[PDB]
Enzyme design. Structure first.
Site, mmCIF file in Angstrom:
data_model
loop_
_atom_site.group_PDB
_atom_site.id
_atom_site.type_symbol
_atom_site.label_atom_id
_atom_site.label_comp_id
_atom_site.label_asym_id
_atom_site.label_seq_id
_atom_site.Cartn_x
_atom_site.Cartn_y
_atom_site.Cartn_z
ATOM 1 N N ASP A 131 -3.969 3.597 4.394
ATOM 2 C CA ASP A 131 -3.618 2.890 3.126
ATOM 3 C C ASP A 131 -4.839 3.104 2.224
ATOM 4 O O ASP A 131 -5.925 3.461 2.734
ATOM 5 C CB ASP A 131 -3.194 1.470 3.435
ATOM 6 C CG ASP A 131 -2.421 0.865 2.283
ATOM 7 O OD1 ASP A 131 -2.341 1.579 1.232
ATOM 8 O OD2 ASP A 131 -1.872 -0.212 2.394
ATOM 9 N N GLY A 132 -4.681 2.934 0.953
ATOM 10 C CA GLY A 132 -5.779 3.101 -0.017
ATOM 11 C C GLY A 132 -5.471 2.135 -1.142
ATOM 12 O O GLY A 132 -4.286 1.768 -1.391
ATOM 13 N N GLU A 191 -5.635 7.041 -1.268
ATOM 14 C CA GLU A 191 -4.507 7.226 -0.359
ATOM 15 C C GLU A 191 -4.619 8.533 0.393
ATOM 16 O O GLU A 191 -4.263 8.556 1.609
ATOM 17 C CB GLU A 191 -3.144 7.189 -1.044
ATOM 18 C CG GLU A 191 -2.725 5.780 -1.529
ATOM 19 C CD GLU A 191 -1.541 5.922 -2.472
ATOM 20 O OE1 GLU A 191 -0.956 6.982 -2.593
ATOM 21 O OE2 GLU A 191 -1.312 4.836 -3.027
ATOM 22 N N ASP A 206 2.792 4.156 3.705
ATOM 23 C CA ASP A 206 3.747 3.769 2.658
ATOM 24 C C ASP A 206 3.329 4.395 1.337
ATOM 25 O O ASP A 206 3.822 3.951 0.272
ATOM 26 C CB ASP A 206 3.847 2.247 2.601
ATOM 27 C CG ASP A 206 2.595 1.571 2.113
ATOM 28 O OD1 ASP A 206 1.499 2.154 2.085
ATOM 29 O OD2 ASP A 206 2.715 0.419 1.671
ATOM 30 N N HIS A 208 6.829 -3.166 2.263
ATOM 31 C CA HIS A 208 7.094 -4.501 2.782
ATOM 32 C C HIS A 208 7.619 -4.545 4.211
ATOM 33 O O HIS A 208 8.067 -5.637 4.601
ATOM 34 C CB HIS A 208 8.191 -5.208 1.942
ATOM 35 C CG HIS A 208 9.519 -4.519 2.129
ATOM 36 N ND1 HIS A 208 9.862 -3.373 1.464
ATOM 37 C CD2 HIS A 208 10.561 -4.870 2.915
ATOM 38 C CE1 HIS A 208 11.094 -3.060 1.805
ATOM 39 N NE2 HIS A 208 11.530 -3.918 2.690
ATOM 40 N N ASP A 244 -4.223 -2.027 4.640
ATOM 41 C CA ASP A 244 -4.108 -2.583 3.257
ATOM 42 C C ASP A 244 -5.261 -3.561 3.029
ATOM 43 O O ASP A 244 -5.992 -3.445 2.057
ATOM 44 C CB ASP A 244 -2.735 -3.175 3.115
ATOM 45 C CG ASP A 244 -2.448 -3.841 1.802
ATOM 46 O OD1 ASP A 244 -2.749 -3.340 0.710
ATOM 47 O OD2 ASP A 244 -1.843 -4.908 1.925
#
Length: 155
Positions: free
Chosen positions: A10-11, A48, A70, A124, A134
């Protein structure tokens, strides 16, 4: 002991450009390695991509990997752009270098050493590992210590 290498990335970024960071969980051999760093002035997209790069770069041999993220930017790049960039010599239709070409070529180089399965999660509904990414990404961006060298307002 897992038979497949598992990566989660994640980024995050507070601005455009702004201080950003990334988080990546790597399950390799029988260890769980965690990577996270903040950059003083960068973008979400670059953070990311950096997540995926640093996890893959830690692999010292040819592996079978499953990468879960994601990120829409990595996804679009991997599924729509990369294949064509390479045939065009990493240029856009108007003839200039692709955006973040530094990171895409760096990521490309890493990808090429492994057998990869991509798992595109919904923001989500990712696993506990994505939520952890995250949170590390977000924390890292609040206390940046590195410089994003390839970042240009430009090209």
């Amino acid at each position: 002991m897992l038979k497949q290498v598992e990566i989660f990335t994640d980024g995050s970024c507070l601005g455009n450009p702004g201080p950003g960071g990334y988080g990546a969980i790597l399950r390799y051999r029988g260890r769980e390695k965690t990577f996270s760093a903040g950059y003083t002035r960068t973008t979400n997209n670059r953070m990311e991509l950096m997540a995926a790069i640093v996890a893959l770069e830690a692999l010292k041999e040819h592996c079978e990997v499953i990468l879960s993220t994601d990120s829409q930017y990595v996804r679009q790049g991997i599924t729509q752009w990369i294949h064509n960039w390479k045939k065009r010599g990493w240029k856009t239709a108007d003839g200039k270098p692709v955006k973040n070409v530094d990171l895409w070529q760096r990521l490309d180089a890493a990808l090429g050493q492994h057998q990869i399965k991509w798992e595109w999660v919904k923001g989500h509904a990712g696993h506990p590992e994505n939520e952890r990414c995250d949170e590390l990404a977000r924390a890292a961006a609040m206390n940046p210590t590195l410089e994003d060298t390839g970042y240009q307002v430009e090209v």
